[PDB]
Amino acid sequence: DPTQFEERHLKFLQQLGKGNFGSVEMCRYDPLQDGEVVAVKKLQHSTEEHLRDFEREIEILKSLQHDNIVKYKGVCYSAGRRNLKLIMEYLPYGSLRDYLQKHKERIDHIKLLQYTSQICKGMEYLGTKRYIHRDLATRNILVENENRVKIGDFGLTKVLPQDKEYYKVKEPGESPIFWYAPESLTESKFSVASDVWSFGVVLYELFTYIEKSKSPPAEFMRMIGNDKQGQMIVFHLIELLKNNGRLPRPDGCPDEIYMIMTECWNNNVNQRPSFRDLALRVDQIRDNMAG
Numbered sequence: 001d002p003t004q005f006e007e008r009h010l011k012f013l014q015q016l017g018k019g020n021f022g023s024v025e026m027c028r029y030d031p032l033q034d035g036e037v038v039a040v041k042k043l044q045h046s047t048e049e050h051l052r053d054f055e056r057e058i059e060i061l062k063s064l065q066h067d068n069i070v071k072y073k074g075v076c077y078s079a080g081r082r083n084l085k086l087i088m089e090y091l092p093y094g095s096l097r098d099y100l101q102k103h104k105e106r107i108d109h110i111k112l113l114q115y116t117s118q119i120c121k122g123m124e125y126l127g128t129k130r131y132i133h134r135d136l137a138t139r140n141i142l143v144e145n146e147n148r149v150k151i152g153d154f155g156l157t158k159v160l161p162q163d164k165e166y167y168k169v170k171e172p173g174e175s176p177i178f179w180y181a182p183e184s185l186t187e188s189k190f191s192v193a194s195d196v197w198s199f200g201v202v203l204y205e206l207f208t209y210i211e212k213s214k215s216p217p218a219e220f221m222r223m224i225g226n227d228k229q230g231q232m233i234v235f236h237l238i239e240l241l242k243n244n245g246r247l248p249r250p251d252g253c254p255d256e257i258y259m260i261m262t263e264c265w266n267n268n269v270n271q272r273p274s275f276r277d278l279a280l281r282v283d284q285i286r287d288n289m290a291g
């Protein structure tokens, strides 16, 4: 509905996030001019290809309704109905990556496992639509309140072809290589199982509390050698992963939780756990610490 969010009533307030190809702004929608705060995603450095990808992303988000997925509100066909902007609920505590850093002193293991469980259920839901997220990372998780997080961005999400259980990317632009499964690096293959690999990296991130020098890029670069540049980095990352190099157990991380991470990081795609497996395992851990 192009009349739902009219550009003349959508007022900019603050910048919330920004990257090479997109940004999110805090805006106020006041049709009666005298209104709700919303989050608005727009492209940056747009092209016809990027705009078509953005249309697919909007359709993906519109099709999702789940407690742990940020809520679609609509679209603004701005610039006289010659451009597109995506309208979403505003989540007041921002990205989980920043929230964990700001509030680590009140976030214990059982809280981390609540966030883990919630991310997992969002991903179970995504898989029922045959969507592959391809960019799971704490920077793409948003915090609604102390007890609720949601997957907040779907800019790299792809729909599986009807007769295959993987999506093969041809020319990969934005590639978060230090979250990628080995078969994504070596064969450009993305699947539910590669999302599970990346979820293991998210779980690692959580239990580092986003401490300085413990991020996946920083750790993998320290193991590879900080002087390496360009494709050499990739070559070494592939060799490292294929022969069982892995992110370390974070300081203070229980062995049981590191074991979850390492089971997600199986080079054998079919042996990785399912998101249903993981959600039940994590919720049983929480419940057996204390319900």
Ligand SMILES: CCS(=O)(=O)N1CC(CC#N)(n2cc(-c3nc(Nc4ccc(C5CCN(C)CC5)cc4)nc4[nH]ccc34)cn2)C1
Pocket: 016, 017, 018, 019, 020, 021, 022, 023, 024, 039, 041, 070, 088, 089, 090, 091, 092, 093, 094, 095, 098, 139, 140, 141, 142, 151, 152, 153, 155
């Ligand atoms: C393609 C690149 S992108 O730019 O498009 N990309 C998407 C991207 C990553 C993800 N997911 N993102 C999304 C949002 C976003 N934020 C919010 N609320 C918010 C509230 C408060 C603060 C403050 C800032 C200052 N201080 C640190 C404390 C928190 C920030 C945000 N609500 C939202 N609803 C939907 C989206 C969204 C933000 N970043 C980044």
